[PDB]
Design a protein around this ligand. Structure first.
Ligand SMILES: NS(=O)(=O)c1nnc(-c2ccccc2Cl)s1
Ligand SMILES: [Zn+2]
Length: 257
């Protein structure tokens, strides 16, 4: 099966998922000097006051916090989007060391980790239909750098122990994802894909310019998770990130100059 190890990692994915070599794959390097400022872009509208988290899950590839998306509770609008996108889950990618871990890079700089808040376009009625459309998903990407602690993240950090191995889940209610946002919502955007299989080209990427800060201790706890299931030989969950892919015929746009 696919993974992030030497025998099943990203350069192998194309054998089972040939869209891996497609024309609008993610992530990409953001070259800040060739990004085009687009004054037509609207500000992002993040409406997460009525967010309802449900559960946190180790799926063997990351951990996901899941939200109730049966209603327009937590939604993303504005920016380069037309329409309303509902939050369904968030997850992270991170490294074995602080100098790597993000999926996107900025002028080839890697960050320690990357947060993805995944939303789907409610005109398609359910997530499974949305991933089959070119405008079906919008993923908000936020970089993490190591420095001070992020108080808003600690609640997540403290449950990881209970979902250490693949397939484990825990109740996770009343978590407010507003606690994970930077001060500024300035962004870059481009059309891209899921960065894990099935690698579908259905995502409008919105990558925030301002990183959030987390402490070494916090990121350290991420690295204690396991890719394996219980009773299996221990494989630490680290470096679950996909390299930058060719930009090909795409323009990255910026909401700021
Ligand atoms: N890293 S990511 O946000 O582009 C992403 N990639 N794959 C995702 C996915 C794949 C299968 C089912 C559900 C999701 Cl949410 S979400
Ligand atoms: Zn992701």
């Amino acid at each position: 099966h696919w993974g992030y190890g030497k025998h099943n990692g990203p350069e192998h994915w194309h054998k089972d998922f040939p869209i891996a070599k497609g024309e609008r794959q993610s992530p990409v390097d953001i070259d800040t000097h060739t990004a085009k400022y687009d004054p037509s872009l609207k500000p992002l509208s993040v409406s997460y006051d009525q967010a309802t988290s449900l559960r946190i899950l180790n799926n063997g590839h990351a951990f996901n916090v899941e939200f109730d998306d049966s209603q327009d509770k937590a939604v993303l609008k504005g920016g380069p989007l037309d329409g309303t996108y509902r939050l369904i889950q968030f997850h992270f990618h991170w490294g074995s060391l602080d100098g790597q871990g993000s999926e996107h890079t900025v002028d080839k700089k890697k960050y320690a980790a990357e947060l993805h808040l995944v939303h789907w376009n409610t005109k398609y009625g359910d997530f499974g239909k949305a991933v089959q459309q070119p405008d079906g998903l919008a993923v908000l990407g936020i970089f993490l750098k190591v420095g001070s602690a992020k108080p808003g993240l600690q609640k997540v950090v403290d449950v990881l122990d209970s979902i250490k191995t693949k397939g484990k889940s825990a109740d996770f209610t009343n978590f407010d994802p507003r606690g994970l946002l930077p001060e500024s919502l300035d962004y870059w955007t481009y059309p891209g894909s899921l960065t894990t299989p099935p690698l579908l080209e259905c995502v409008t990427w919105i990558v925030l310019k301002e990183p959030i800060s987390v402490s070494s201790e916090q990121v350290l706890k991420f690295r204690k998770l396991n890719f394996n299931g219980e009773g299996e030989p221990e494989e630490l969950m680290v470096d679950n990130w996909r390299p930058a892919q060719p930009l090909k015929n795409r323009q990255i746009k910026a909401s700021f100059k």
